[PDB]
Amino acid sequence: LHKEPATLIKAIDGDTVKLMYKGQPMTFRLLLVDTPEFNEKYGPEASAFDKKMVENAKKIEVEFDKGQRTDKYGRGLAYIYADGKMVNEALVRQGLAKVAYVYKGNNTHEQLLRKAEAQAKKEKLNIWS
Ligand SMILES: Cc1cn([C@H]2C[C@H](OP(=O)(O)O)[C@@H](COP(=O)(O)O)O2)c(=O)[nH]c1=O
Ligand SMILES: [Ca+2]
């Protein structure tokens, strides 16, 4: 899999972000994770955490998996990196997201993320507290 450029347009919530990709605005939904909706517990913390990480980043990159690149809502599905660091991973590592929505064909970083959830759970962080 390959990292590709993108630039931030707007942080939306814990697991969606508006990016410019190939010069077009699109909403991205983070692969393999589920954050709490803003209305729910840790939702604002998730949103704040995604927001901070993407807005502070000099460099954003989009990494598509091997499967579907767009969902049924027209959202791009990807791994999103902020200065070389995966946002999908960081959210899980901090207990702000669960590993989730694991579909066959779009699951390359499954085990990497499941290692991060185990650590966050060990540590009883946020959702796991
Ligand atoms: C992460 C991801 C979500 N989805 C869809 C399934 C869910 O459908 P439903 O809307 O019918 O529940 C929805 C969950 O995303 P959200 O957590 O943003 O709502 O997005 C995919 O289709 N593929 C994916 O890889
Ligand atoms: Ca969600």
UniProtKB/Swiss-Prot annotation:
Question: Where in the cell?
Answer: Secreted
Q: Which residues bind Ca(2+)?
A: D15, D34, T35
Q: Which residues form the active site?
A: R29, E37, R75
Here the segments flagged for biased composition (Basic and acidic residues) are 109-125
- The superkingdom listed in its UniProt entry is Bacteria
Question: Coiled coil located at which positions?
Answer: none
Ranges where the record places region Disordered:
109-129
The protein in question is named: Nuclease A
Covered part of the full sequence, start to end and full length, is 89 to 223 of 231
